[PDB]
Amino acid sequence: NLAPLPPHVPEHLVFDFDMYNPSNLSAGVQEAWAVLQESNVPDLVWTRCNGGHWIATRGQLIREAYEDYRHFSSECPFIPREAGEAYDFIPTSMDPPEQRQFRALANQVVGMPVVDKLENRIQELACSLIESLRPQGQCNFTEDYAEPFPIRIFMLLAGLPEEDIPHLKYLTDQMTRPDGSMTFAEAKEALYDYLIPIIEQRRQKPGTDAISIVANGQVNGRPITSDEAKRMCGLLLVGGLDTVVNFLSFSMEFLAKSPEHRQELIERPERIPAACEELLRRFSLVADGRILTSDYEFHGVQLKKGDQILLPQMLSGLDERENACPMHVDFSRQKVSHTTFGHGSHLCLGQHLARREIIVTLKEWLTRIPDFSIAPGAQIQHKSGIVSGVQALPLVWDPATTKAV
Ligand code: MNR
Numbered sequence: 001n002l003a004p005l006p007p008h009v010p011e012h013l014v015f016d017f018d019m020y021n022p023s024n025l026s027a028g029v030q031e032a033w034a035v036l037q038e039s040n041v042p043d044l045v046w047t048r049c050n051g052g053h054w055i056a057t058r059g060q061l062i063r064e065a066y067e068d069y070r071h072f073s074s075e076c077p078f079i080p081r082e083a084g085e086a087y088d089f090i091p092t093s094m095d096p097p098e099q100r101q102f103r104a105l106a107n108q109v110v111g112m113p114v115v116d117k118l119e120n121r122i123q124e125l126a127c128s129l130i131e132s133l134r135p136q137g138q139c140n141f142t143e144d145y146a147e148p149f150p151i152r153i154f155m156l157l158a159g160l161p162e163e164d165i166p167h168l169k170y171l172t173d174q175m176t177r178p179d180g181s182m183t184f185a186e187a188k189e190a191l192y193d194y195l196i197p198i199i200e201q202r203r204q205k206p207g208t209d210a211i212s213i214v215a216n217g218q219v220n221g222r223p224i225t226s227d228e229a230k231r232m233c234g235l236l237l238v239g240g241l242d243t244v245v246n247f248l249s250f251s252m253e254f255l256a257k258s259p260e261h262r263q264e265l266i267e268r269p270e271r272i273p274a275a276c277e278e279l280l281r282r283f284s285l286v287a288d289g290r291i292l293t294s295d296y297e298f299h300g301v302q303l304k305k306g307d308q309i310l311l312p313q314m315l316s317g318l319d320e321r322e323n324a325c326p327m328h329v330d331f332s333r334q335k336v337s338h339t340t341f342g343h344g345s346h347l348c349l350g351q352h353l354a355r356r357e358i359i360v361t362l363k364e365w366l367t368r369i370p371d372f373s374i375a376p377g378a379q380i381q382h383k384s385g386i387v388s389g390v391q392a393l394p395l396v397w398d399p400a401t402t403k404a405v
């Protein structure tokens with residue numbers, strides 16, 4: 001339903017886009033969001049859906065708003081408002097200056113030196129899962145690889161048992177793509193219910209896992225509190241369970257549909273890192289936002305204190321103002337412009353882990369199963385929300401074209 005139009009919003013700016021179920025979803029999720037960049041649509045629109053909020057539809061505005069934390073605060077970063085109010089993860093619910101101290105700690109557990117440490121296990125897991133699928137000539141890519149690969153890596157890093165995956169994956173999905181069985185607040189409280197005892201145990205008897213490190217950590221030279229450690233670990237769970245998992249499916253759907261692009265990477269594997277970046281642009285998948293701290297005139301539009309603004313990280317890279325022919329995938333694209341890992345002071349801390357996972361997947365998949373397709377007759381369905389995804393991805397191939405390594 002449509003929330004009543006606030007007095008301060010002019011009617012010519014109304015465009016009733018539903019971030020949780022966009023009109024054009026069947027064309028693909030990125031395509032559905034790109035409707036916001038059609039020629040009739042203003043740079044900044046108001047939607048009456050999901051309680052009413054602004055949407056910045058172009059890279060220039062999205063980047064500018066992410067840079068200006070004084071006007072656009074992270075305190076309430078999710079739509080709808082109830083979700084944004086309940087949201088208290090660290091560092092993503094905080095603005096600078098307070099935010100900054102927590103980034104170093106998060107970097108300790110998911111940043112580059114740690115990725116380098118885990119590089120062998122990452123490689124070994126990808127190779128193992130792919131080799132197991134290889135002789136079958138088919139898989140359901142979402143459950144058979146997209147989920148277990150990044151998630152088992154995360155559970156290893158976090159020292160959490162793999163038997164907990166179904167529960168934690170259900171909870172994380174309710175925060176980004178709710179099926180309506182749980183409010184954001186209920187899902188967050190259930191995640192915290194899971195974490196509270198584990199954090200307590202690991203502050204008492206620290207191990208070497210990520211939860212132990214965060215829970216016994218210091219922030220700018222003082223001890224982290226139990227509460228802070230909880231709000232940081234909650235964020236890490238969501239990052240581990242509902243980002244790379246979805247992106248891998250978008251990428252492998254594309255490669256399955258594009259023999260020419262697979263061939264390019266098979267023949268030119270040095271281009272895989274560049275291909276990763278271009279896929280990250282084309283199949284960008286996150287959309288959160290900010291809350292106005294004061295009345296503010298932004299690009300000729302009067303924003304009111306307390307108004308929410310969706311700043312879709314997804315849209316910057318799809319904006320033809322940033323990238324010529326933005327819906328075309330070009331691994332040789334000269335300046336790949338995107339905000340897929342965010343922009344400003346909250347730039348993704350997991351991005352090195354994500355890239356390693358993506359690049360390892362592409363290299364190890366294409367080495368063993370170079371030639372694959374969507375199952376004949378299958379219709380791939382996307383899903384939209386704070387993080388967008390792929391419902392299911394049935395792939396097929398001829399085992400005779402495969403290679404065991
Ligand atoms: C397990 C760890 C993580 C993984 C894997 C991961 C993977 C990915 C990923 C995969 C393709 C994409 C796309 C992605 C996208 C983002 N990510 Mn990431 N992410 N991500 C974090 C951990 C992780 N991410 C953390 C922690 C922050 C918060 C930094 C801060 O607020 O100061 C963050 C922040 C962000 C933001 C900024 C949100 C904002 O400004 O409100 C975006 C966008």
Ligand SMILES: [K+]
Pocket residue numbers: 075076077084085086087088093
């Ligand atoms: K909040």
